[PDB]
Design a protein around this nucleic acid. Structure first.
Ligand SMILES: [K+]
Ligand SMILES: [K+]
Ligand SMILES: [K+]
Ligand SMILES: [K+]
Ligand SMILES: [K+]
Ligand SMILES: [K+]
Ligand SMILES: [K+]
Ligand SMILES: [K+]
Ligand SMILES: [K+]
Ligand SMILES: [K+]
Ligand SMILES: [K+]
Ligand SMILES: [K+]
Ligand SMILES: [Mg+2]
Ligand SMILES: [Mg+2]
Ligand SMILES: [Mg+2]
Ligand SMILES: [Mg+2]
Ligand SMILES: [Mg+2]
Ligand SMILES: [Mg+2]
Ligand SMILES: [Mg+2]
Ligand SMILES: [Mg+2]
Ligand SMILES: [Mg+2]
Ligand SMILES: [Mg+2]
Ligand SMILES: [Mg+2]
Ligand SMILES: [Mg+2]
Ligand SMILES: [Mg+2]
Ligand SMILES: [Mg+2]
Ligand SMILES: [Mg+2]
Ligand SMILES: [Mg+2]
Ligand SMILES: [Mg+2]
Ligand SMILES: [Mg+2]
Ligand SMILES: [Mg+2]
Ligand SMILES: [Mg+2]
Ligand SMILES: [Mg+2]
Ligand SMILES: [Mg+2]
Ligand SMILES: [Mg+2]
Ligand SMILES: [Mg+2]
Ligand SMILES: [Mg+2]
Ligand SMILES: [Mg+2]
Ligand SMILES: [Mg+2]
Ligand SMILES: [Mg+2]
Ligand SMILES: [Mg+2]
Ligand SMILES: [Mg+2]
Ligand SMILES: [Mg+2]
Ligand SMILES: [Mg+2]
Ligand SMILES: [Mg+2]
Ligand SMILES: [Mg+2]
Ligand SMILES: [Mg+2]
Ligand SMILES: [Mg+2]
Ligand SMILES: [Mg+2]
Ligand SMILES: [Mg+2]
Ligand SMILES: [Mg+2]
Ligand SMILES: [Mg+2]
Ligand SMILES: [Mg+2]
Ligand SMILES: [Mg+2]
Ligand SMILES: [Mg+2]
Ligand SMILES: [Mg+2]
Ligand SMILES: [Mg+2]
Ligand SMILES: [Mg+2]
Ligand SMILES: [Mg+2]
Ligand SMILES: [Mg+2]
Lengths: 148, 140, 80, 95, 20, 166, 107, 97, 191
RNA sequence: CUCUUACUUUUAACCAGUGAAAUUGACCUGCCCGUGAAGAGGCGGGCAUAACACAGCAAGACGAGAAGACCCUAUGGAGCUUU
RNA sequence: CUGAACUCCUCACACCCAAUUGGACCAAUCUAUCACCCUAUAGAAGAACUAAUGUUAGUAUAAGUAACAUGAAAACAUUCUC
RNA sequence: CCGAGCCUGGUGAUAGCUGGUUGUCCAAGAUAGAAUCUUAGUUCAACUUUAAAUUUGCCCACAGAACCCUCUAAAUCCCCUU
RNA sequence: GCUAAACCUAGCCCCAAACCCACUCCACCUUACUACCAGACAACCUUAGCCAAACCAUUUACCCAAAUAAAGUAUAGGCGAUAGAAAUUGAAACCUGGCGCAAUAGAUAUAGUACCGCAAGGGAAAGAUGAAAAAUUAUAACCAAGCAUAAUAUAGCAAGGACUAACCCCUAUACCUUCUGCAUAAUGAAUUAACUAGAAAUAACUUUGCAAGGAGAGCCAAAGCUAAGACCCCCGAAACCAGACGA
């Protein structure tokens, strides 16, 4: 513990204190980097590579409509409604090699991602889910046990 | 779970066993003995250097005495014996002085002879051949 | 009273050493002590000395008249 | 800092930090320059442009800011049309 | 210099009252 | 407390053989919890140490110390105890082999001082121990004479070796 | 320290080595345990090492005693009457071999 | 002084008593029992400590929250003071910041 | 350790009876300065860093880790010839001596763990014999655990138990990461 | 006071009884000069030196006693005064 | 010539810096399982005291020191002195 | 024991200040500065320690680095080779 | 050889469960524990401060009725120190146990007694045979300091090297703390026994599990994730405030 002073006696100042000089974390001007962060909508990205991977392994069934319930049941995506997630955004990554024909319902989709599914004969729709609805559709069984 | 030292008695006895022959309370009282025992052990450790030093001072004194009985100073004996390729050390030389006095006189005589040869050589201008006892045996 | 057995056991061993030192036990023959095999000891005796003894003769050499007369008295006392 | 809150026994975030610094998921912290809105009439164009830059903090400051904020602020976020989305991940970084 | 007085403290009586 | 001194008069020796010499009789006796200081008692036990039973009783009879009257009482009852119980033929054929004092159990009391201060006084007690042995008092050791000093000095000059050599 | 311990002059037993050399180690008494982790190394020494060690030293009578014990010990006795007890608690087979050989060489 | 002069009474341990013999049984109640019961539900003890771990400050907060209303006046006062002392120690004192 | 709760507790200097007043003035007495007679330096004072129970030691290894441990214990028993498979646990009699003699004849260890598929369907004969023994313990399959397996020298499993154990333990290798506790309904669980 | 003296009592000292306190790192506890954290029983160089009580003395042991009250320091207190 | 812990010689080698930092071991106690004249592998913790004018208790030193107490004779009746 | 009583409680008040801080063994290890109601203290550098990554570090050859001005200084910086 | 040493019980601690609670006759709110007389008085009303903010002046967590999670998020604040929700979510619960203490411990407790204080109030210490004491000349001994058995012989941190030999010879300026530096005539310590002081997050690291997933709903994830191991002392002011007790 050293010798004398505050180090040995255990009474050194709080973290961030600099001995009385205006500390670094205070002398920097405030700026709205994080303003409203908790009210910003978030979308878990789902790539066409990941979707093709899931279809090839039998984890998602392209013979039936694919929505959040089917993606979550296949453990394709993890949605956190308590963390301001509003659903999945379909991203273009993997468009060149995407071959599956699917009917998929997402919350957001890039223009190139839409083209990749439509070129193969599939259908893509963008569907909104409110925070309560998103929780229910993702984990239906826990909801059914509430008797509502 | 409350733990207490149960064998403190033996820990104390490890120090006190070395302090039985001390004078006064420092032979029985741990607080006192431990400090004195530490000092004793440090002294014992450093004494190994002095033992060697003193041992050699003793041999030099004894060799000096024996040499003076033959009219030779200590540096003349040790120096000139080396020049005869006699590598006897001071420990052996001191023992010889006590228990082999006739051999020691011979060693003193040999040193004295080599010493006189040195003087003759130094006095000469190189004309003289090397002394009989001054010749060095070479090793290749 | 402190918990434990090890320290107490160690102290008992020390108390028994001091008791013996205070009253040293009367000495006894090595044969009477444990770990003794007379036949093995006889053979080792010769081997230590690097001598090829005859085991019959060597054993007789150790037998003394006093031991024989006393051995017989014990036999008579026990009615054997 | 409050290492253990009295109500939850949980470490607390220093909110002063949240109001001034942006944490990129890769570990970097971004800030503005002190004085960037002060006495602009006496400052040259070159100096004023420097003051407007968004700049990175050093290792020591980053380590301090990391300690002064809870894990929640270090999670990966997927905000829609985030202006800083590209900067969350490093590229071609050797050590 | 302010007056300094340390009052004496008596020990518990029982410690000097025990009999065989 | 320890009471080993009273248990030494209970040792029974095996019968002696016909050729063995007459064994002197030993009598242990003591008195416990004497209201007296062991330091003051030590000077009285040191006085008679080595004396005969009759000489010790004469020295203690004309001493002014309080411990003197107590030791003399302990000696008188140890003398009778010897002849009556320990098979001692002559009561005057005894001498003081061992005589010492020991600390007893003491009590603590308050001693009042001025200014509300106090001290603790010990009410001191001691023990007295004595051992009587049958026979005459061992002759005192004569003082070392010049012949013994010289004989010892020359013996040291003859026992010295040559050190730190062969 | 030297002042705190006894000393002696260098000597031999019955002028050993002058006319002939006689091994001074006379007896070895091992006390191993059938069960017990402390004696694991001592049990392995009795299986392969003790038999070969006796062949080399025919003048030493070795007494191996297997009995319940928490601390296995070897007791060495010498012709001059000295008795030495050395614990072999938790020692490896190689460690015990070294110790036993040292005892054989001492006077 | 300070060491006993006799051996203590020998320690007799019955290693095959019913308590020791059946130690561990049903610790895999969930894995082998269709997860109907969690192993934490086997823990018996204070209501504020079953299946939960924390440091002394955290334990004190938890105890006051769960059973503080049922605690004795003297006990609750000490608990409040302990929470106050521990709050200052952990948040304000120590080698590290 | 996971279910260990320590009840050891001591009193700090704040909880020891009394100790309010400063025992004597700071200066002038010639004595050491003290603030309370219940300081940890004093006889009868508080404990500086003593136990502050009740104290919980609860923690949980990952479910997969605990399942793997069971597999290792079964393999070790088989590899070392300590595992015996039975068709059933039905004995001819309920006398404990029969079971004891049976183990001795078959060269089983001193202790034997007997595992039946279900508590309710344990044969009455084995229940009577084991109830009167100390080193022969009868447990249901749901009670199998590493500690008991290691404490008992010999493990005896019935054939139905073997099927039971393989089903439960191999399910851990092929399962998804959970979406919610497995107690809740799943498509294919239970069975 | 120059300039002190005599006597009595108390204390004192010895014998008997009773029996504290501060103090105490350990001590086998000399003098001179020199040295040194700058004033030495303990270091260097010299000198002195069988052991052990009792009674005096107060030069030293930087003697005991009270964590200096003077002085300064502390983002330590309190009393009082006030534009 | 004398003269180090420098260097050489026989054998061995982790074995001479405050704060701080890294590492290898370990006393006793309890628990699990061993062991069974005092142990082993592990899990734990009120887990180690030559020093805080430390706390409690014992006994020393100062010290048998400071200090303390009962008028006289007698037949213990009494008388005398103050 | 009154510059403002005593008792209990808040209270384990607070102290950048003094004192104390308990088994064994080995190893590395001595320090440019800045700010601060700050100089009896802290935070950042610097030095120091452990682990990790991969590549040069130290020692240095020529060539090269200012006029103004009185000491035309000892030197430094840079630097392949080794 | 004394003084002493040694012991294992008394009880106690932390949980669980369970709601809790008196009574012989007589006396007792006046000066309580006092058989027996003319009165009529009557309860409520924000805690503060230490302390943190390295001063301090706004401010500075204190069960308030479900574990968990939402979350240390929204939000509050000399926007500093720090304080801090809710919607929503949602499990278990079989007293008679103990890796708790064992006479300086554990309750202060053999007792709120002795003793201390006018009062409020403060507040101890300690016991130890055995089947039988209607077996008491009984249970051996061995162990701290202090003493005794047994004072002392030039010279010196009291020892070391040694030596035929205790000493004589040679070598050697106690310890701790504190300092640029201490034999220092700077600090603490008579001695023995017992007691008496490093508590944890953030990351990282090491070793397992599984792996684009990990985790026994929440959370994290561009090799991650889960679990474990391993780092943060003791004593001490003058003070401040509240409510009692005292002429
Ligand atoms: K912001
Ligand atoms: K802290
Ligand atoms: K006159
Ligand atoms: K004087
Ligand atoms: K100081
Ligand atoms: K300061
Ligand atoms: K008490
Ligand atoms: K000190
Ligand atoms: K000085
Ligand atoms: K000084
Ligand atoms: K001073
Ligand atoms: K009045
Ligand atoms: Mg310090
Ligand atoms: Mg400092
Ligand atoms: Mg209190
Ligand atoms: Mg205080
Ligand atoms: Mg207590
Ligand atoms: Mg006088
Ligand atoms: Mg007197
Ligand atoms: Mg002093
Ligand atoms: Mg001087
Ligand atoms: Mg005098
Ligand atoms: Mg005087
Ligand atoms: Mg001095
Ligand atoms: Mg003074
Ligand atoms: Mg001062
Ligand atoms: Mg203040
Ligand atoms: Mg030399
Ligand atoms: Mg060297
Ligand atoms: Mg080396
Ligand atoms: Mg061990
Ligand atoms: Mg262990
Ligand atoms: Mg401790
Ligand atoms: Mg101690
Ligand atoms: Mg102390
Ligand atoms: Mg005097
Ligand atoms: Mg007087
Ligand atoms: Mg008078
Ligand atoms: Mg107060
Ligand atoms: Mg403090
Ligand atoms: Mg080093
Ligand atoms: Mg300022
Ligand atoms: Mg400074
Ligand atoms: Mg350079
Ligand atoms: Mg270069
Ligand atoms: Mg403040
Ligand atoms: Mg102030
Ligand atoms: Mg809520
Ligand atoms: Mg008690
Ligand atoms: Mg003693
Ligand atoms: Mg000398
Ligand atoms: Mg120390
Ligand atoms: Mg200074
Ligand atoms: Mg010096
Ligand atoms: Mg000093
Ligand atoms: Mg000072
Ligand atoms: Mg920690
Ligand atoms: Mg104030
Ligand atoms: Mg007030
Ligand atoms: Mg009045």
């Amino acid at each position: 513990r050293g010798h004398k002073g505050e180090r040995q006696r255990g009474t050194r100042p709080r973290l961030g204190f600099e001995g009385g000089q205006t500390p670094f974390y205070i002398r920097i001007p405030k700026y709205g980097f994080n303003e409203g962060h908790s009210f910003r909508r978030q979308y878990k990205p789902l790539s066409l590579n990941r979707l093709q991977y899931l279809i090839d392994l039998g984890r998602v069934d392209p013979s039936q409509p694919i929505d959040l319930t089917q993606l979550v049941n296949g453990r394709g995506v993890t949605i956190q409604p308590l963390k301001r997630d509003y659903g999945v955004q379909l991203v273009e990554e993997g468009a060149d090699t995407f071959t599956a024909k699917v009917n998929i319902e997402v919350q957001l989709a890039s223009e190139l991602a839409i083209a990749a599914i439509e070129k193969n004969g599939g259908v893509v729709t963008t569907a909104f889910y409110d925070p309560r609805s998103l929780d229910i559709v993702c984990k239906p069984v826990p909801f059914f046990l509430r008797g509502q | 779970l409350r733990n207490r030292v149960t064998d403190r008695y033996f820990r104390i006895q490890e120090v006190l066993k070395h302090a039985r022959h001390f004078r006064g309370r420092k032979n029985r009282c741990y607080r006192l003995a431990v400090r004195t025992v530490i000092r004793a052990f440090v002294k014992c450790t450093k004494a190994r250097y002095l033992k060697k030093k003193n041992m050699r001072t003793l041999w030099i004194n004894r060799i000096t005495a024996a040499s003076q009985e033959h009219g030779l100073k200590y540096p003349a004996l040790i120096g000139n014996l080396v020049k005869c390729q006699v590598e006897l050390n001071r420990k052996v030389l001191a023992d010889l002085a006590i228990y082999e006095p006739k051999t020691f006189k011979s060693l003193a005589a040999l040193a004295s002879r080599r010493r006189h040869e040195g003087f003759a050589a130094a006095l000469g201008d190189g004309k003289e051949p090397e002394g009989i006892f001054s010749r060095v045996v070479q090793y290749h | 009273v402190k918990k434990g057995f090890r320290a107490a056991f160690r102290f008992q061993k020390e108390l028994e050493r001091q008791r013996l030192l205070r009253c040293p036990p009367p000495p006894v023959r090595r044969s009477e002590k444990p770990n003794w095999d007379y036949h093995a000891e006889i053979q080792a005796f010769g081997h230590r000395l690097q001598e090829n003894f005859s085991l019959d003769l060597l054993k007789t050499a150790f037998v003394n008249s006093c031991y024989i007369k006393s051995e017989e008295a014990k036999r008579q006392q026990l009615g054997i | 800092l409050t290492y253990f809150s009295a109500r939850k026994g949980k470490r607390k975030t220093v909110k002063a930090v949240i109001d001034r610094f942006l944490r990129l998921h890769c570990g970097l912290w971004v800030r503005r320059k002190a004085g960037y809105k002060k006495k602009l009439w006496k400052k040259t164009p070159a100096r004023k442009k420097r003051l407007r830059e968004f700049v990175f903090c050093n290792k020591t400051q980053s380590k301090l800011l990391d300690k002064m904020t809870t894990s929640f602020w270090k999670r990966r976020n997927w905000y829609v049309d985030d202006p800083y989305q590209k900067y969350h991940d490093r590229t071609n970084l050797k050590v | 210099t302010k007056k300094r007085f340390t009052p004496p403290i008596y020990q518990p009586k029982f410690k000097t009252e025990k009999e065989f | 407390i320890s009471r080993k001194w009273e248990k030494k008069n209970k040792i029974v020796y095996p019968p002696q053989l016909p050729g063995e010499p007459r064994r002197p009789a030993e009598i242990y006796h003591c008195r416990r919890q004497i209201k007296y200081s062991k330091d003051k008692m030590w000077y009285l036990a040191k006085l008679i140490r080595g004396m005969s039973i009759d000489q010790a009783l004469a020295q203690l009879e004309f001493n002014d110390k309080k411990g003197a009257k107590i030791i003399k009482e302990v000696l008188l009852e140890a003398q009778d105890m010897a002849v009556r119980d320990h098979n001692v033929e002559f009561r005057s054929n005894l001498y003081i082999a061992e005589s010492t004092s020991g600390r007893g159990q003491c009590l603590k009391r308050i001693r009042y001082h001025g200014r509300g201060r106090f001290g603790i006084m010990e009410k001191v007690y001691c023990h007295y121990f004595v051992k009587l042995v049958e026979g005459p008092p061992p002759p005192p050791e004569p003082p070392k004479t010049a012949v013994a000093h010289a004989k010892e000095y020359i013996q040291q000059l003859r026992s010295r070796t040559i050190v730190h050599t062969l | 320290t030297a002042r705190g311990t006894p000393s002696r002059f260098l000597a031999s037993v019955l002028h050993n080595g002058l006319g002939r050399y006689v091994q001074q180690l006379q007896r070895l008494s091992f006390s191993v345990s059938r069960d017990g982790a402390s004696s694991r190394g001592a049990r392995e020494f009795v299986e392969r090492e003790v038999i070969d060690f006796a062949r080399r030293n025919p003048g030493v009578v070795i007494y191996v005693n297997s009995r319940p014990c928490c601390v296995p010990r070897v007791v060495a006795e010498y012709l001059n009457g000295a008795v030495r007890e050395e614990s072999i608690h938790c020692k490896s087979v190689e460690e015990i071999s070294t110790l036993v050989q040292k005892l054989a060489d001492q006077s | 002084i300070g060491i006993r002069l006799t051996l203590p009474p020998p320690k007799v341990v019955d290693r095959w008593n019913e308590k020791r013999a059946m130690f561990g049984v049903y610790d895999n109640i969930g894995i082998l029992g269709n997860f109907e019961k969690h192993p934490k539900e086997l823990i018996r003890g204070p209501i504020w400590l079953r299946g939960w771990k924390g440091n002394e400050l955290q334990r004190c907060i938890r105890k006051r929250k769960m059973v503080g209303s049922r605690m004795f006046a003297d006990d609750l006062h000490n608990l409040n003071k302990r929470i106050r002392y521990l709050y200052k120690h952990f948040n304000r004192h120590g080698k590290f910041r | 350790n996971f279910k260990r709760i320590s009840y050891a507790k001591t009193k700090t200097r704040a909880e020891v009876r009394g100790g309010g007043r400063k025992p004597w003035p700071q200066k002038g007495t010639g004595r050491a300065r003290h603030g309370s007679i219940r300081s940890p330096l004093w006889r009868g004072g508080g404990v500086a860093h003593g136990p502050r129970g009740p104290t919980s030691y609860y923690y949980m290894l990952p479910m997969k880790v605990r399942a793997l441990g069971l597999k290792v214990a079964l393999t070790v028993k088989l590899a070392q010839d300590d595992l015996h498979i039975m068709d059933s646990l039905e004995l001819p009699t309920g006398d404990p001596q029969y079971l004891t003699e049976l183990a001795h004849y078959r060269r089983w260890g001193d202790s034997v763990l007997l595992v039946d598929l279900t508590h309710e369907e344990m044969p009455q004969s084995i229940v009577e014999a084991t109830s009167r023994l100390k080193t022969f313990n009868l447990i249901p399959a749901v009670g199998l655990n590493v500690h008991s397996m290691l404490k008992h020298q010999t493990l005896v499993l019935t054939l139905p138990t073997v099927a039971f154990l393989e089903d439960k333990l191999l399910w851990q290798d092929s399962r998804y990461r959970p979406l919610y506790p497995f107690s809740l309904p799943y498509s294919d669980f239970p069975r």
